Amino acid sequence: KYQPTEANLKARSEFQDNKFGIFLHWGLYAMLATGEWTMTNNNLNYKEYAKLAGGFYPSKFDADKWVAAIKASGAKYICFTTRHHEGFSMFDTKYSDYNIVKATPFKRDVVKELADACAKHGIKLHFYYSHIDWYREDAPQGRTGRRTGRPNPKGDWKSYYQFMNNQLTELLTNYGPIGAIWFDGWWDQDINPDFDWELPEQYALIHRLQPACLVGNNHHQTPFAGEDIQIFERDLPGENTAGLSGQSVSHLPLETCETMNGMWGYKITDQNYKSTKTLIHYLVKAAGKDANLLMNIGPQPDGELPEVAVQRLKEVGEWMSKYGETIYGTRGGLVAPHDWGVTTQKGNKLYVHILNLQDKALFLPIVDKKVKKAVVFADKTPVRFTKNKEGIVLELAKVPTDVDYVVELTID
Amino acid sequence: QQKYQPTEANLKARSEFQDNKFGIFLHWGLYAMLATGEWTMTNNNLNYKEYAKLAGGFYPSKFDADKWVAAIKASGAKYICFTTRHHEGFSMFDTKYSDYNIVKATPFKRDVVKELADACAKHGIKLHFYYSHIDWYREDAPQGRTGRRTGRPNPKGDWKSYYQFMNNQLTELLTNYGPIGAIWFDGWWDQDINPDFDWELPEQYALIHRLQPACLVGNNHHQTPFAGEDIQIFERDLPGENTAGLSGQSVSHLPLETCETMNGMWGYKITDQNYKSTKTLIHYLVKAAGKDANLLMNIGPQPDGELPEVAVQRLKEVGEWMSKYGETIYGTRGGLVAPHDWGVTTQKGNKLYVHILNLQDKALFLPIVDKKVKKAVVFADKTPVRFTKNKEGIVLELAKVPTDVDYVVELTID
Numbered sequence: 142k143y144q145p146t147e148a149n150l151k152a153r154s155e156f157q158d159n160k161f162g163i164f165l166h167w168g169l170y171a172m173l174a175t176g177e178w179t180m181t182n183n184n185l186n187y188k189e190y191a192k193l194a195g196g197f198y199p200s201k202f203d204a205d206k207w208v209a210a211i212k213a214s215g216a217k218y219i220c221f222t223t224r225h226h227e228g229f230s231m232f233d234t235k236y237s238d239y240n241i242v243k244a245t246p247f248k249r250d251v252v253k254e255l256a257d258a259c260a261k262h263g264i265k266l267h268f269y270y271s272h273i274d275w276y277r278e279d280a281p282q283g284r285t286g287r288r289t290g291r292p293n294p295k296g297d298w299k300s301y302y303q304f305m306n307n308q309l310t311e312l313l314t315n316y317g318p319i320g321a322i323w324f325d326g327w328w329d330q331d332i333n334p335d336f337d338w339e340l341p342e343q344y345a346l347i348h349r350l351q352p353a354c355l356v357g358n359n360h361h362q363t364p365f366a367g368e369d370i371q372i373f374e375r376d377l378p379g380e381n382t383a384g385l386s387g388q389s390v391s392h393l394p395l396e397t398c399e400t401m402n403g404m405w406g407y408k409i410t411d412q413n414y415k416s417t418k419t420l421i422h423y424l425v426k427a428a429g430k431d432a433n434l435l436m437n438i439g440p441q442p443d444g445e446l447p448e449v450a451v452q453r454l455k456e457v458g459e460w461m462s463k464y465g466e467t468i469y470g471t472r473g474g475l476v477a478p479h480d481w482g483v484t485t486q487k488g489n490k491l492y493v494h495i496l497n498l499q500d501k502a503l504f505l506p507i508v509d510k511k512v513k514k515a516v517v518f519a520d521k522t523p524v525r526f527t528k529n530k531e532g533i534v535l536e537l538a539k540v541p542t543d544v545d546y547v548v549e550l551t552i553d
Numbered sequence: 554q555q556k557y558q559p560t561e562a563n564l565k566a567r568s569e570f571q572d573n574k575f576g577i578f579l580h581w582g583l584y585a586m587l588a589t590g591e592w593t594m595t596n597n598n599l600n601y602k603e604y605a606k607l608a609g610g611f612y613p614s615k616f617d618a619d620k621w622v623a624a625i626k627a628s629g630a631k632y633i634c635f636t637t638r639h640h641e642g643f644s645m646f647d648t649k650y651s652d653y654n655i656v657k658a659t660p661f662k663r664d665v666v667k668e669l670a671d672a673c674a675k676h677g678i679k680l681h682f683y684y685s686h687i688d689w690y691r692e693d694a695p696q697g698r699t700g701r702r703t704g705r706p707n708p709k710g711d712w713k714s715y716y717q718f719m720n721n722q723l724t725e726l727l728t729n730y731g732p733i734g735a736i737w738f739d740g741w742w743d744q745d746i747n748p749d750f751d752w753e754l755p756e757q758y759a760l761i762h763r764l765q766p767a768c769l770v771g772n773n774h775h776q777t778p779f780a781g782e783d784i785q786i787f788e789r790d791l792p793g794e795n796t797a798g799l800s801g802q803s804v805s806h807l808p809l810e811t812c813e814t815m816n817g818m819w820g821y822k823i824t825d826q827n828y829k830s831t832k833t834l835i836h837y838l839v840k841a842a843g844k845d846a847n848l849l850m851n852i853g854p855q856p857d858g859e860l861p862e863v864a865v866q867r868l869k870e871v872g873e874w875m876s877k878y879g880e881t882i883y884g885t886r887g888g889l890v891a892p893h894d895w896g897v898t899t900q901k902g903n904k905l906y907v908h909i910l911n912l913q914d915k916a917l918f919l920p921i922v923d924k925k926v927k928k929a930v931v932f933a934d935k936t937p938v939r940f941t942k943n944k945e946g947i948v949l950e951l952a953k954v955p956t957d958v959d960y961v962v963e964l965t966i967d
């Protein structure tokens with residue numbers, strides 16, 4: 142029954158072309174510095190938690206600096222937590238005083254400042270928005286938020302649902318063009334299979350306000366009517382390592398998310414950042430399975446992006462400046478992921494991303510199609526290959542030890 | 554630190570607009586029946602309800618959007634600016650926010666804007682929408698200088714209602730008709746008697762950019778452009794010029810556009826059948842380009858739905874010229890050499906096109922001193938033009954006294 146508009150369909154293709162975005166988890170939980178789940182993990186009282194807002198002053202926040210650092214990685218979009226499960230709004234809302242402008246001494250709308258910086262730098266802006274809420278007294282309780290001290294575990298769905306829609310209206314009118322709404326929390330009511338999220342009306346609201354905006358919902362199900370992208374939580378499309386999303390794979394654009402260290406919202410214990418090579422491999426492997434990668438940073442309560450995260454972004458971007466052509470604008474490749482790497486493709490080119498190879502030769506199961514040419518992407522040096530009944534065999538100059546040794550094949 | 558930050562999409566759209574250079578204005582509304590001008594309502598103090606009765610007689614039976622766009626494309630024009638709703642307040646599109654519109658209130662019963670959008674898309678012509686900030690018909694519209702003798706009950710209007718009505722219609726225009734190249738506002742000057750009048754333009758410009766980031770915003774206020782506008786309009790005058798008395802404002806850094814009429818009026822006028830010559834119209838386009846400006850040349854369609862026959866022929870002959878010389882206009886910016894009495898220059902890449910429009914001599918001095926001129930040829934047949942250097946520039950030696958509409962000399966610079 143859902144009919145995407147032309148503008149929406151163009152947006153979907155642009156999203157797939159862009160390939161690489163940065164997740165930003167920032168909320169009051171950054172003060173506690175123990176994770177965005179702390180409020181329900183530690184059964185904190187909702188009114189006591191809200192007192193934190195009077196001490197929230199991220200004095201070194203600079204939206205220009207954030208977006209410039211994110212652009213330097215080769216990322217093309219940002220997904221920002223406008224309001225997480227804690228229920229604190231990081232924007233100037235007229236529907237709750239529990240927001241960054243009214244309830245903190247900082248008194249600044251960081252979502253507006255980020256929107257302006259994104260326009261300056263040519264970065265698209267996506268909004269994460271929590272379907273669940275551990276703070277509001279009208280929010281129904283599912284699996285989480287049962288020990289916040291609130292009086293009405295049933296909530297008042299008509300009131301809560303209207304509040305959500307009123308806020309979505311603000312986010313889709315007051316902050317310029319928005320590339321996507323990224324919903325989360327559906328899983329909180331999976332104990333109640335008859336729970337009615339009333340998503341057709343809510344998705345219709347979004348597309349009415351901005352037809353080009355993409356709707357995603359992190360529910361781990363076959364996408365519902367009106368969704369424009371499909372999300373896989375730390376699990377890569379056809380895979381369920383973390384146990385969070387081993388679902389089907391569909392006709393909508395795919396996106397998977399990873400953290401750069403161990404955490405989403407800022408954790409002060411967590412200073413083990415993954416290597417630049419590991420991060421580049423996340424991006425390449427995602428692209429190789431026809432999926433975007435959303436890589437998360439958790440900003441500090443002083444308003445700075447972690448120093449090590451900024452440096453890792455910079456080095457990923459140095460790689461992208463050389464190899465971005467093999468990622469941007471591509472779709473998942475003809476040759477499926479293997480232990481040695483993955484392929485992406487664009488036009489008549491198949492990029493063979495050799496990530497983990499022990500040998501000086503590589504068999505590729507390319508049988509039906511003729512490989513017209515094979516070169517080293519970096520310098521266009523020829524790569525010899527032979528044909529056998531099962532495909533082709535690349536003869537490489539050495540055992541590759543590069544982060545990603547890309548061979549560019551021409552196929553017609 | 555700037556409130557308004559143009560997106561990459563908008564900045565690209567600005568450069569495409571400047572590349573396209575030539576557009577056609579179309580003023581069409583109920584005033585076409587009276588055939589005395591779009592200002593007739595306020596000039597003759599017509600009652601708003603009496604004027605609205607005209608709509609029951611509006612039936613432009615020969616309207617053919619495909620024929621219009623084809624005739625306009627043949628001129629070399631690359632976009633069209635069409636009056637969706639003029640000061641008379643009559644909506645030329647199917648709108649849910651007023652029944653005073655071409656579908657609901659006339660026997661013609663057709664959304665001509667829809668048909669024009671479809672035809673523009675088919676022929677690859679960009680569509681811009683003119684939209685009036687003032688309204689002589691609605692009872693909630695505030696009155697300024699004009700529309701004070703319409704018989705309406707409330708000179709103060711109800712701005713909250715009227716402004717919400719405008720933004721509802723703008724949403725329709727940007728939702729139901731595909732990609733729109735520009736919104737072209739007009740009427741700010743109606744309230745210049747009230748220095749504190751709040752048009753609430755930031756919110757309205759933001760709505761346009763929110764729904765279509767690549768859509769350009771223009772406002773014919775004759776002022777320094779307000780934040781949020783993407784083009785600057787000069788009415789009936791080259792930028793920097795003021796022969797018509799409507800253009801005393803300074804020239805900004807936004808893309809420039811000047812508008813002109815083919816005859817004397819914007820809306821169709823049955824007395825006014827004195828059409829400027831093809832040569833004059835080509836001179837308008839070339840002089841505009843030489844001043845780093847687009848030209849928007851107007852036609853006022855007839856109440857039977859046809860474009861004036863003489864205007865169509867003029868378009869055709871302008872297009873014959875563009876078929877030969879368009880490379881010297883399209884994709885160019887105002888040239889190194891500023892406009893002179895003899896003509897103007899335009900530039901693109903390593904080429905400076907010297908447009909000789911009015912020269913009585915067989916030679917032409919050009920003040921090109923910093924840059925080296927590698928080569929000079931007659932654009933039309935690539936025949937070499939000899940030139941010499943002097944301390945103040947160069948002197949071209951021409952084969953004859955030029956009498957062409959535009960005798961173009963192509964210089965190669967580096």
Ligand SMILES: [Cl-]
Pocket residue numbers: 889890891920
């Ligand atoms: Cl000069």
Ligand code: NA
Pocket residue numbers: 670674680730731732733
């Ligand atoms: Na269109």
